[PDB]
A paper describes a structure:
Folick et al. further identified a [name] 8 ([name]) that mediates the retrograde signaling between lysosomal lipid hydrolysis and nuclear transcription. [name] is a member of a larger family of proteins termed the intracellular lipid-binding proteins (iLBPs), which includes both fatty acid binding proteins (FABPs), cellular retinoic acid binding proteins (CRABPs), and cellular retinoid binding proteins (CRBPs). Interestingly, [name] itself is also sufficient to prolong lifespan through activating NHR-49 and NHR-808. Here, we have expanded our knowledge of the FABP family by reporting the first structure of a [name] FABP, [name], and exploring its ligand specificity.
The [name] structure was solved in the C121 space group at high resolution (1.3 Å), with the asymmetric unit containing a monomer, which was consistent with size exclusion chromatography. The crystal structure includes all 137 amino acids of wild type [name], 92 waters, and two sulfate anions. [name] adopts a typical lipocalin fold, present in all FABPs, consisting of a N-terminal alpha helix-turn-helix motif lid (αA- αB) and a twisted beta barrel containing ten antiparallel strands (βA-βJ). The interior cavity is lined with polar and hydrophobic residues generating a solvent accessible surface area of 825 Å2 and volume of 1170 Å3. There are fragments of continuous electron density present throughout the pocket; however, we were unable to model in a fatty acid with confidence. We do predict that fatty acid is binding to [name] based on lipid MS data, therefore, the fragmented electron density likely reflects that only a fraction of the [name] in the crystal bound to fatty acid, or the fatty acid does not adopt a preferred conformation in the pocket. A network of eleven waters are present in the putative lipid binding pocket and anchored via hydrogen bonds with amino acids glutamine 56 and arginine 132. The [name] structure contains two lysines (K24 and K34) and an arginine (R33) present in the alpha helical lid, and a hydrophobic patch (25-IGVGLLI-32) within the turn region, suggesting [name] is a “collisional” FABP, and directly interacts with membranes or membrane proteins to acquire fatty acids. The interior cavity of [name] is lined with hydrophobic residues (F19, F60, L65, F67, F73, F94, F110, T112, and F134), which can stabilize fatty acyl tails of fatty acids via hydrophobic interactions. The absence of these conserved amino acids and having large pocket volume suggest that fatty acids can bind variably, possibly explaining why there was such diversity in our lipid MS data and disordered electron density within the interior of the crystal structure.
Residue numbers in the entry: 0 to 137
The structure:
């Protein structure tokens, strides 16, 4: 719980990934898209504008910009082009996003972003699948 929110601010480059394509398959992404999305090494930019956070992911395949306020539910248009009811909290040093499905045939996910020894780590969880990603400061 020691890590402060401000330590996340900056630009981060993907250096390792595990189970990302499998995570995308689990949440219903088609083969061509999940293959292409998993081949990239995106840059994640985290910035704070007043009380609005921005987690923007940039890559050759798609740019994904997410804006939110902590503790405030919002409708997220996720990169899979489906809409979700998303809620991001900051708990014990970590950003936790609950991306809740709206349509019953969709899938919900939990995203956790945290810092360890200068690196930024993420997990994306849905159903039986957890994806793990690691980033280094740009």
């Amino acid at each position: 719980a020691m890590v402060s929110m401000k330590e996340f601010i900056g630009r981060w480059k993907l250096v390792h990934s595990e189970n990302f394509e499998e995570y995308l398959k689990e949440i219903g992404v088609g083969l061509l898209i999940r293959k292409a999305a998993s081949l990239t090494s995106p840059t994640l930019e985290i910035k704070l504008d007043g009380d609005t956070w921005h987690f923007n992911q940039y890559s050759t395949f798609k740019n994904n910009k997410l804006a939110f306020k902590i503790r405030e539910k919002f409708v997220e248009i996720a990169p899979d082009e489906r809409s979700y009811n998303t809620l991001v909290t900051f708990e014990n040093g970590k950003f936790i996003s609950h991306q809740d499905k709206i349509k019953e045939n969709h899938h919900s996910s939990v995203f956790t972003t945290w810092l360890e020894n200068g690196k930024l780590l993420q997990t994306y969880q849905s159903g039986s699948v957890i994806c793990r990603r690691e980033f280094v400061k740009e």
